[PDB]
Design a protein around this nucleic acid. Structure first.
Ligand SMILES: [Mg+2]
Ligand SMILES: [Mg+2]
Ligand SMILES: [Mg+2]
Ligand SMILES: [Mg+2]
Ligand SMILES: [Mg+2]
Ligand SMILES: [Mg+2]
Ligand SMILES: [Mg+2]
Ligand SMILES: [Mg+2]
Ligand SMILES: [Mg+2]
Ligand SMILES: [Mg+2]
Ligand SMILES: [Mg+2]
Ligand SMILES: [Mg+2]
Ligand SMILES: [Mg+2]
Ligand SMILES: [Mg+2]
Ligand SMILES: [Mg+2]
Ligand SMILES: [Mg+2]
Ligand SMILES: [Mg+2]
Ligand SMILES: [Mg+2]
Ligand SMILES: [Mg+2]
Ligand SMILES: [Mg+2]
Ligand SMILES: [Mg+2]
Ligand SMILES: [Mg+2]
Ligand SMILES: [Mg+2]
Ligand SMILES: [Mg+2]
Ligand SMILES: [Mg+2]
Ligand SMILES: [Mg+2]
Ligand SMILES: [Mg+2]
Ligand SMILES: [Mg+2]
Ligand SMILES: [Mg+2]
Ligand SMILES: [Mg+2]
Ligand SMILES: [Mg+2]
Ligand SMILES: [Mg+2]
Ligand SMILES: [Mg+2]
Ligand SMILES: [Mg+2]
Ligand SMILES: [Mg+2]
Ligand SMILES: [Mg+2]
Ligand SMILES: [Mg+2]
Ligand SMILES: [Mg+2]
Ligand SMILES: [Mg+2]
Ligand SMILES: [Mg+2]
Ligand SMILES: [Mg+2]
Ligand SMILES: [Mg+2]
Ligand SMILES: [Mg+2]
Ligand SMILES: [Mg+2]
Ligand SMILES: [Mg+2]
Ligand SMILES: [Mg+2]
Ligand SMILES: [Mg+2]
Ligand SMILES: [Mg+2]
Ligand SMILES: [Mg+2]
Ligand SMILES: [Mg+2]
Ligand SMILES: [Mg+2]
Ligand SMILES: [Mg+2]
Ligand SMILES: [Mg+2]
Ligand SMILES: [Mg+2]
Ligand SMILES: [Mg+2]
Ligand SMILES: [Mg+2]
Ligand SMILES: [Mg+2]
Ligand SMILES: [Mg+2]
Ligand SMILES: [Mg+2]
Ligand SMILES: [Mg+2]
Ligand SMILES: [Mg+2]
Ligand SMILES: [Mg+2]
Ligand SMILES: [Mg+2]
Ligand SMILES: [Mg+2]
Ligand SMILES: [Mg+2]
Ligand SMILES: [Mg+2]
Ligand SMILES: [Mg+2]
Ligand SMILES: [Mg+2]
Ligand SMILES: [Mg+2]
Ligand SMILES: [Mg+2]
Ligand SMILES: [Mg+2]
Ligand SMILES: [Mg+2]
Ligand SMILES: [Mg+2]
Ligand SMILES: [Mg+2]
Ligand SMILES: [Mg+2]
Ligand SMILES: [Mg+2]
Ligand SMILES: [Mg+2]
Ligand SMILES: [Mg+2]
Ligand SMILES: [Mg+2]
Ligand SMILES: [Mg+2]
Ligand SMILES: [Mg+2]
Ligand SMILES: [Mg+2]
Ligand SMILES: [Mg+2]
Ligand SMILES: [Mg+2]
Ligand SMILES: [Mg+2]
Ligand SMILES: [Mg+2]
Ligand SMILES: [Mg+2]
Ligand SMILES: [Mg+2]
Ligand SMILES: [Mg+2]
Ligand SMILES: [Mg+2]
Ligand SMILES: [Mg+2]
Ligand SMILES: [Mg+2]
Ligand SMILES: [Mg+2]
Ligand SMILES: [Mg+2]
Ligand SMILES: [Mg+2]
Ligand SMILES: [Mg+2]
Ligand SMILES: [Mg+2]
Ligand SMILES: [Mg+2]
Ligand SMILES: [Mg+2]
Ligand SMILES: [Mg+2]
Ligand SMILES: [Mg+2]
Ligand SMILES: [Mg+2]
Ligand SMILES: [Mg+2]
Ligand SMILES: [Mg+2]
Ligand SMILES: [Mg+2]
Ligand SMILES: [Mg+2]
Ligand SMILES: [Mg+2]
Ligand SMILES: [Mg+2]
Ligand SMILES: [Mg+2]
Ligand SMILES: [Mg+2]
Ligand SMILES: [Mg+2]
Ligand SMILES: [Mg+2]
Ligand SMILES: [Mg+2]
Ligand SMILES: [Mg+2]
Ligand SMILES: [Mg+2]
Ligand SMILES: [Mg+2]
Ligand SMILES: [Mg+2]
Ligand SMILES: [Mg+2]
Ligand SMILES: [Mg+2]
Ligand SMILES: [Mg+2]
Ligand SMILES: [Mg+2]
Ligand SMILES: [Mg+2]
Ligand SMILES: [Mg+2]
Ligand SMILES: [Mg+2]
Ligand SMILES: [Mg+2]
Ligand SMILES: [Mg+2]
Ligand SMILES: [Mg+2]
Ligand SMILES: [Mg+2]
Ligand SMILES: [Mg+2]
Ligand SMILES: [Mg+2]
Ligand SMILES: [Mg+2]
Ligand SMILES: [Mg+2]
Ligand SMILES: [Mg+2]
Ligand SMILES: [Mg+2]
Ligand SMILES: [Mg+2]
Ligand SMILES: [Mg+2]
Ligand SMILES: [Mg+2]
Ligand SMILES: [Mg+2]
Ligand SMILES: [Mg+2]
Ligand SMILES: [Mg+2]
Ligand SMILES: [Mg+2]
Ligand SMILES: [Mg+2]
Ligand SMILES: [Mg+2]
Ligand SMILES: [Mg+2]
Ligand SMILES: [Mg+2]
Ligand SMILES: [Mg+2]
Ligand SMILES: [Mg+2]
Ligand SMILES: [Mg+2]
Ligand SMILES: [Mg+2]
Ligand SMILES: [Mg+2]
Ligand SMILES: [Mg+2]
Ligand SMILES: [Mg+2]
Ligand SMILES: [Mg+2]
Ligand SMILES: [Mg+2]
Ligand SMILES: [Mg+2]
Ligand SMILES: [Mg+2]
Ligand SMILES: [Mg+2]
Ligand SMILES: [Mg+2]
Ligand SMILES: [Mg+2]
Ligand SMILES: [Mg+2]
Ligand SMILES: [Mg+2]
Ligand SMILES: [Mg+2]
Ligand SMILES: [Mg+2]
Ligand SMILES: [Mg+2]
Ligand SMILES: [Mg+2]
Ligand SMILES: [Mg+2]
Ligand SMILES: [Mg+2]
Ligand SMILES: [Mg+2]
Ligand SMILES: [Mg+2]
Ligand SMILES: [Mg+2]
Ligand SMILES: [Mg+2]
Ligand SMILES: [Mg+2]
Ligand SMILES: [Mg+2]
Ligand SMILES: [Mg+2]
Ligand SMILES: [Mg+2]
Ligand SMILES: [Mg+2]
Ligand SMILES: [Mg+2]
Ligand SMILES: [Mg+2]
Ligand SMILES: [Mg+2]
Ligand SMILES: [Mg+2]
Ligand SMILES: [Mg+2]
Ligand SMILES: [Mg+2]
Ligand SMILES: [Mg+2]
Ligand SMILES: [Mg+2]
Ligand SMILES: [Mg+2]
Ligand SMILES: [Mg+2]
Ligand SMILES: [Mg+2]
Ligand SMILES: [Mg+2]
Ligand SMILES: [Mg+2]
Ligand SMILES: [Mg+2]
Ligand SMILES: [Mg+2]
Ligand SMILES: [Mg+2]
Ligand SMILES: [Mg+2]
Ligand SMILES: [Mg+2]
Ligand SMILES: [Mg+2]
Ligand SMILES: [Mg+2]
Ligand SMILES: [Mg+2]
Ligand SMILES: [Mg+2]
Ligand SMILES: [Mg+2]
Ligand SMILES: [Mg+2]
Ligand SMILES: [Mg+2]
Ligand SMILES: [Mg+2]
Ligand SMILES: [Mg+2]
Ligand SMILES: [Mg+2]
Ligand SMILES: [Mg+2]
Ligand SMILES: [Mg+2]
Ligand SMILES: [Mg+2]
Ligand SMILES: [Mg+2]
Ligand SMILES: [Mg+2]
Ligand SMILES: [Mg+2]
Ligand SMILES: [Mg+2]
Ligand SMILES: [Mg+2]
Ligand SMILES: [Mg+2]
Ligand SMILES: [Mg+2]
Ligand SMILES: [Mg+2]
Ligand SMILES: [Mg+2]
Ligand SMILES: [Mg+2]
Ligand SMILES: [Mg+2]
Ligand SMILES: [Mg+2]
Ligand SMILES: [Mg+2]
Ligand SMILES: [Mg+2]
Ligand SMILES: [Mg+2]
Ligand SMILES: [Mg+2]
Ligand SMILES: [Mg+2]
Ligand SMILES: [Mg+2]
Ligand SMILES: [Mg+2]
Ligand SMILES: [Mg+2]
Ligand SMILES: [Mg+2]
Ligand SMILES: [Mg+2]
Ligand SMILES: [Mg+2]
Ligand SMILES: [Mg+2]
Ligand SMILES: [Mg+2]
Ligand SMILES: [Mg+2]
Ligand SMILES: [Mg+2]
Ligand SMILES: [Mg+2]
Ligand SMILES: [Mg+2]
Ligand SMILES: [Mg+2]
Ligand SMILES: [Mg+2]
Ligand SMILES: [Mg+2]
Ligand SMILES: [Mg+2]
Ligand SMILES: [Zn+2]
Lengths: 95, 70, 107, 97
RNA sequence: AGCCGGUAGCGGGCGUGGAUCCCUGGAUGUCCGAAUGGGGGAACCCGGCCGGCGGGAACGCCGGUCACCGCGCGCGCGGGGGGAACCUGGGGAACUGAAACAUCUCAGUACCCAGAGGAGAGGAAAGAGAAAUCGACUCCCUGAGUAGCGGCGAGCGAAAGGGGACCAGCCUAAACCGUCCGGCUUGUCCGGGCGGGGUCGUGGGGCCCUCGGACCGAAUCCCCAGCCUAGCCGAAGCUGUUGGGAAGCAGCGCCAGAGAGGGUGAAAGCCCCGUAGGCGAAAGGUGGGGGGAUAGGUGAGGGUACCCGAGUACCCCGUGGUUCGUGGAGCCAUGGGGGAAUCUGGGCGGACCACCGCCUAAGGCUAAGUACUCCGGGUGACCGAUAGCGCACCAGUAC
RNA sequence: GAAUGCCGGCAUGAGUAACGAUAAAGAGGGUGAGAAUCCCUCUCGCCGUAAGCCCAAGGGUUCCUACGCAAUGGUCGUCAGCGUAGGGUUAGGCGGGACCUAAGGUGAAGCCGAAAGGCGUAGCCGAAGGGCAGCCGGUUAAUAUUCCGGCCCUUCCCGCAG
RNA sequence: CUCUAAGCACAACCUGCGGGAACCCGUACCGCAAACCGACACAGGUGGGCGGGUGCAAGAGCACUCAGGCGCGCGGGAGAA
């Protein structure tokens, strides 16, 4: 049906992402084809905040193997959204 | 979920208009994202709930697609 | 389309052949992908266990090993005898397993 | 040269047979074949310019079927032709076969 | 009655309120690909238009629509690409053989290309060819390695007839009517549509005179059986013994329209899966068979000589096809030139002529018998891991 | 039993040649089951229009960190571009696209060719050429003209004013 | 930038200011090399920029050095042909 909950997939659980909460920058795993305008509206519908800046980057999957079988982990995309001054995303300040 | 709850879910969904159906899916999709968060911090013991909600969303969209196609 | 299984959890069966021939016991479990069954108290093998949770002593446990389904025969609850399985269509139309010896139902 | 638009005459493959000797019917020992190789025989294609309904139509035709083009000009006087394009015109004249 | 694929486990669930699973129909189906809004280094990028979403105008997202080409009066319909072999058409080698080599052979094969379909081609005599005969076409056997062809070398190689498989015949053009539209050489005009008429070789049809006034029936459509895409019922054995294990050995029985085969701890008709013999479809596919509709189909003399497929027949030049390599070279086909007639016309019977016979050219369609094996099943004096497919296995992979 | 036959297995040569630039090493301390070979310190030597630094191709996780040492590494190995796992690439201004054209490619029109196809004006595509707005510093184990800080700037939309 | 055509001059453009809006892909690391081309951690091959100092006539030459980076992934002895 296409909802904000299709764009945002999971939070990014890393010491690097956590260190950004203090400045209001929250890092999410998002859908690989989602644009910056889309992620903006998806966060603002999902978490009741105002997004003033969105950075994005693609994260290629790591090649892995299991014995004889060489494979690859799926590709992913991270978005870092800056919320308006004084706002916060409680579902992430967790953590 | 349980087979009787699926049956009841399908009776009730079929009494809903397309607007109600969209609003329900939007709600269950939100709860699904909440389940993925919980599961990603190791907090979803009952991981069967993830699949159940996903099929629920499938049934609802199936019935929504039904009601715009009689 | 399915593995045909003449025996069910957990009816009563005779183990008609093998080391435990003559034993009568309850079908604990049925394994269609293996055409096997597990019969309570039959086929007891010694499995070795590492020290751990569940076995902080280590040592060994007892396990029922599976039996090939053809070594097993239901004991009919009407006449109490080991028997082959016949099919019978009930008045409503459902089919049930009946006893080739007398005719009683086996469920 | 290609294809007669009217008859569909097209190039055909023919052999070129080189011969020596005196034909038996002239008292010779007979003709011997000193070379056979493939060649093509083309239709005698020419351009016919005709003017139909104040438009100029150009046909690529075998010389054999040149009169068949003017035949189509006559049979087109009963067709409602004005206002049409030279392409659409030729189609009408050609559909009259 | 178990289940959440291979796949165990962690951690959690479902199922006699019928799950898993199997069949059928439907729904969803990102992006690329004929790929088709446009572009592009396939799976990426960038737009128009209408509607929606956000604070939304810029920005973005969602839904819809937008290529080219053909055919019919901007609207429809169709086309495109794929498919293991098979098929038809358009093109078309060489090694090799001729113990050299060029005609010839290999061979209209290999291959390229276009197209077709579950087949394709062919097909209702301008046939055969010598029987006062046969009677569409395709396919098998035979005719026959015959007749012939052939640097008469190497080689190449028919047809009629006979025995069989299958079986089926149709629509049209023209004459002559009618109508509509067009033209401006004004009409008994010419042309274009459409409709009626008509379809044959003993010739047939048109038009005008007399007379005579229902059977047949599709290859099209409907219904149905049958079949396919899951399935299901299915006889009869116990004990002792050796042994890890019985199905072996021993005792005593039993079934059989079932003693094919495979499994089970070793060697089992009666333990299991099966086998003989039976049973089964709401849904989709098929339906060449049974039934029913529709289209369609049909006389005699008599007179008239209107019509019977044109750059065609026919002749000549250059070639192909056929057994025919220029041969006495006809026949079928046709690139060039010349160029008719409508039955008192025309083609053929191997130059040609006479006679005597056969057949009706220049429009189209047509099941079945035939071919193939990607697919499914059945069966082997077929293989059994260097074998059998290149692959029994994560192979068109690694490399 | 032979085909310099085929596939495979294992021998011989042989503990032999070699271990890949003659820029070069020594010691102390540490770690560890194990140390010439890993880490730290001091001494020594070599490059220094490079053997240093930054771009572009190409490569494609080789980056950082933890845990490893069967194999890979021409020795060794506690080390590693190796194995296992987690983390890591942040842009209106850098580069490319939503801009332009070049050769060339493609190609409505048009031309040609048995088929397949060959051409072809405009147009379209096509760059490392034209055009176009960001500098300095700080910060991470790992990114930074991208995040942060300071000071600047560009385009689009809408409004007001002239 | 300038010129005008259709059109339009309730528009439209230019200048100034203000608010708002600003998408897609690359960005790690190697990169004269042990990560690229050479079957190898192979003395070979690989385009552009920076490339300090002293002396030697000059210089990107040459020698030694800065910054920075290395001693080239077998060693220990012996001191025959
Ligand atoms: Mg969807
Ligand atoms: Mg964050
Ligand atoms: Mg993005
Ligand atoms: Mg959005
Ligand atoms: Mg980015
Ligand atoms: Mg990006
Ligand atoms: Mg990823
Ligand atoms: Mg991943
Ligand atoms: Mg995942
Ligand atoms: Mg993601
Ligand atoms: Mg999910
Ligand atoms: Mg995940
Ligand atoms: Mg779902
Ligand atoms: Mg059964
Ligand atoms: Mg007993
Ligand atoms: Mg048991
Ligand atoms: Mg039975
Ligand atoms: Mg039932
Ligand atoms: Mg039941
Ligand atoms: Mg009971
Ligand atoms: Mg000649
Ligand atoms: Mg003579
Ligand atoms: Mg000759
Ligand atoms: Mg000759
Ligand atoms: Mg030849
Ligand atoms: Mg030639
Ligand atoms: Mg011409
Ligand atoms: Mg002329
Ligand atoms: Mg003229
Ligand atoms: Mg002529
Ligand atoms: Mg004609
Ligand atoms: Mg659990
Ligand atoms: Mg568990
Ligand atoms: Mg019940
Ligand atoms: Mg049911
Ligand atoms: Mg779509
Ligand atoms: Mg496209
Ligand atoms: Mg394109
Ligand atoms: Mg819109
Ligand atoms: Mg908002
Ligand atoms: Mg909007
Ligand atoms: Mg958009
Ligand atoms: Mg669109
Ligand atoms: Mg094609
Ligand atoms: Mg096709
Ligand atoms: Mg063929
Ligand atoms: Mg052919
Ligand atoms: Mg051919
Ligand atoms: Mg050639
Ligand atoms: Mg030859
Ligand atoms: Mg030769
Ligand atoms: Mg030969
Ligand atoms: Mg020869
Ligand atoms: Mg020879
Ligand atoms: Mg020779
Ligand atoms: Mg030859
Ligand atoms: Mg020849
Ligand atoms: Mg041959
Ligand atoms: Mg030949
Ligand atoms: Mg072939
Ligand atoms: Mg057939
Ligand atoms: Mg056919
Ligand atoms: Mg006929
Ligand atoms: Mg015949
Ligand atoms: Mg007769
Ligand atoms: Mg006849
Ligand atoms: Mg007949
Ligand atoms: Mg004979
Ligand atoms: Mg011959
Ligand atoms: Mg020959
Ligand atoms: Mg011949
Ligand atoms: Mg031949
Ligand atoms: Mg023949
Ligand atoms: Mg004959
Ligand atoms: Mg016959
Ligand atoms: Mg008329
Ligand atoms: Mg008519
Ligand atoms: Mg008619
Ligand atoms: Mg008729
Ligand atoms: Mg008729
Ligand atoms: Mg008719
Ligand atoms: Mg007839
Ligand atoms: Mg006659
Ligand atoms: Mg007559
Ligand atoms: Mg029929
Ligand atoms: Mg018919
Ligand atoms: Mg049965
Ligand atoms: Mg039985
Ligand atoms: Mg015993
Ligand atoms: Mg026994
Ligand atoms: Mg016995
Ligand atoms: Mg039998
Ligand atoms: Mg058998
Ligand atoms: Mg057997
Ligand atoms: Mg026996
Ligand atoms: Mg046996
Ligand atoms: Mg035997
Ligand atoms: Mg048996
Ligand atoms: Mg048997
Ligand atoms: Mg049967
Ligand atoms: Mg049966
Ligand atoms: Mg049946
Ligand atoms: Mg019938
Ligand atoms: Mg009849
Ligand atoms: Mg009649
Ligand atoms: Mg008659
Ligand atoms: Mg006449
Ligand atoms: Mg005729
Ligand atoms: Mg005709
Ligand atoms: Mg002629
Ligand atoms: Mg003749
Ligand atoms: Mg001549
Ligand atoms: Mg001729
Ligand atoms: Mg021939
Ligand atoms: Mg000839
Ligand atoms: Mg010839
Ligand atoms: Mg001849
Ligand atoms: Mg002729
Ligand atoms: Mg001629
Ligand atoms: Mg005659
Ligand atoms: Mg005549
Ligand atoms: Mg003739
Ligand atoms: Mg003649
Ligand atoms: Mg004849
Ligand atoms: Mg004769
Ligand atoms: Mg004849
Ligand atoms: Mg005829
Ligand atoms: Mg046909
Ligand atoms: Mg046929
Ligand atoms: Mg098969
Ligand atoms: Mg098979
Ligand atoms: Mg064998
Ligand atoms: Mg093997
Ligand atoms: Mg093999
Ligand atoms: Mg073996
Ligand atoms: Mg073998
Ligand atoms: Mg295979
Ligand atoms: Mg195969
Ligand atoms: Mg092989
Ligand atoms: Mg493999
Ligand atoms: Mg020998
Ligand atoms: Mg050798
Ligand atoms: Mg050999
Ligand atoms: Mg040998
Ligand atoms: Mg060998
Ligand atoms: Mg070898
Ligand atoms: Mg081996
Ligand atoms: Mg070997
Ligand atoms: Mg060997
Ligand atoms: Mg070896
Ligand atoms: Mg030896
Ligand atoms: Mg050796
Ligand atoms: Mg040795
Ligand atoms: Mg030695
Ligand atoms: Mg030696
Ligand atoms: Mg030596
Ligand atoms: Mg050596
Ligand atoms: Mg060496
Ligand atoms: Mg040495
Ligand atoms: Mg050196
Ligand atoms: Mg060295
Ligand atoms: Mg030296
Ligand atoms: Mg040096
Ligand atoms: Mg040292
Ligand atoms: Mg040292
Ligand atoms: Mg000390
Ligand atoms: Mg060491
Ligand atoms: Mg060591
Ligand atoms: Mg040391
Ligand atoms: Mg060293
Ligand atoms: Mg160190
Ligand atoms: Mg010191
Ligand atoms: Mg210097
Ligand atoms: Mg590489
Ligand atoms: Mg790796
Ligand atoms: Mg190692
Ligand atoms: Mg080691
Ligand atoms: Mg080791
Ligand atoms: Mg290890
Ligand atoms: Mg190694
Ligand atoms: Mg080593
Ligand atoms: Mg090495
Ligand atoms: Mg260690
Ligand atoms: Mg490293
Ligand atoms: Mg590593
Ligand atoms: Mg990193
Ligand atoms: Mg920025
Ligand atoms: Mg845009
Ligand atoms: Mg562009
Ligand atoms: Mg351009
Ligand atoms: Mg064109
Ligand atoms: Mg050509
Ligand atoms: Mg072109
Ligand atoms: Mg051009
Ligand atoms: Mg452009
Ligand atoms: Mg281009
Ligand atoms: Mg461009
Ligand atoms: Mg550029
Ligand atoms: Mg320039
Ligand atoms: Mg530039
Ligand atoms: Mg720029
Ligand atoms: Mg600046
Ligand atoms: Mg800076
Ligand atoms: Mg950190
Ligand atoms: Mg770095
Ligand atoms: Mg900044
Ligand atoms: Mg104003
Ligand atoms: Mg004006
Ligand atoms: Mg105004
Ligand atoms: Mg501004
Ligand atoms: Mg965009
Ligand atoms: Mg790159
Ligand atoms: Mg970067
Ligand atoms: Mg960098
Ligand atoms: Mg570097
Ligand atoms: Mg170099
Ligand atoms: Mg360089
Ligand atoms: Mg370097
Ligand atoms: Mg390196
Ligand atoms: Mg490498
Ligand atoms: Mg090479
Ligand atoms: Mg290399
Ligand atoms: Mg090295
Ligand atoms: Mg090197
Ligand atoms: Mg160089
Ligand atoms: Mg320079
Ligand atoms: Mg300095
Ligand atoms: Mg300098
Ligand atoms: Mg100094
Ligand atoms: Mg001095
Ligand atoms: Mg100086
Ligand atoms: Mg000097
Ligand atoms: Mg200097
Ligand atoms: Mg120097
Ligand atoms: Mg230094
Ligand atoms: Mg050092
Ligand atoms: Mg060294
Ligand atoms: Mg070096
Ligand atoms: Mg070395
Ligand atoms: Mg010595
Ligand atoms: Zn009983």
């Amino acid at each position: 049906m296409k909802t904000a909950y299709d764009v945002i997939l999971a939070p990014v659980l890393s010491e690097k992402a956590y260190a950004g909460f203090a400045e209001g920058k929250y890092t999410f795993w998002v859908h690989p084809k989602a644009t910056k305008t889309e992620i903006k509206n998806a966060v603002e519908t999902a978490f009741k905040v105002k997004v003033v800046k969105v950075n994005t980057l693609h994260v290629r999957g790591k090649k892995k193997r299991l014995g004889r079988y060489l494979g690859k982990r799926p590709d992913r995309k991270k978005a870092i959204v800056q919320v308006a001054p004084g706002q916060k995303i409680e579902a992430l300040e967790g953590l | 979920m349980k087979l009787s709850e699926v049956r009841k879910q399908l009776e009730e969904a079929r009494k809903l208009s397309p607007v109600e159906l969209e609003k329900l899916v939007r709600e269950k999709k939100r709860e699904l994202m909440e389940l993925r968060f919980q599961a990603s911090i190791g907090q979803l013991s009952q991981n069967h709930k993830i699949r159940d909600l996903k099929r629920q969303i499938a049934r609802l969209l199936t019935v929504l697609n039904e009601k715009r196609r009689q | 389309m399915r593995v045909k299984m003449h025996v069910k959890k957990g009816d009563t069966v005779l183990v008609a052949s093998g080391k435990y021939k003559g034993r009568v016991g309850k079908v604990k479990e049925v394994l269609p992908k293996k055409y096997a069954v597990i019969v309570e108290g039959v086929n007891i093998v010694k499995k070795a266990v590492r020290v751990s949770p569940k076995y902080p002593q280590g040592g060994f446990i007892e396990k029922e090993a599976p039996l090939h389904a053809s070594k097993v025969r239901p004991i009919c609850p009407a006449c109490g005898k080991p028997t082959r399985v016949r099919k019978k269509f009930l008045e409503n139309g459902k089919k049930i397993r009946v006893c080739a010896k007398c005719g009683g139902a086996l469920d | 040269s290609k294809v007669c638009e009217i008859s569909g005459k097209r190039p055909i493959v023919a052999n070129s047979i080189q011969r020596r000797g005196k034909a038996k019917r002239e008292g010779g020992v007979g003709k011997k074949t000193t070379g056979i190789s493939k060649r093509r025989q083309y239709p005698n294609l020419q351009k016919v310019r005709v003017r139909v309904a104040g438009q100029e139509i150009t046909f690529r035709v075998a010389a054999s079927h040149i009169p068949k083009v003017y035949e189509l000009v006559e049979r087109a006087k009963g067709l409602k032709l004005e206002g049409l394009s030279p392409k659409e015109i030729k189609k009408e004249l050609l559909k009259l076969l």
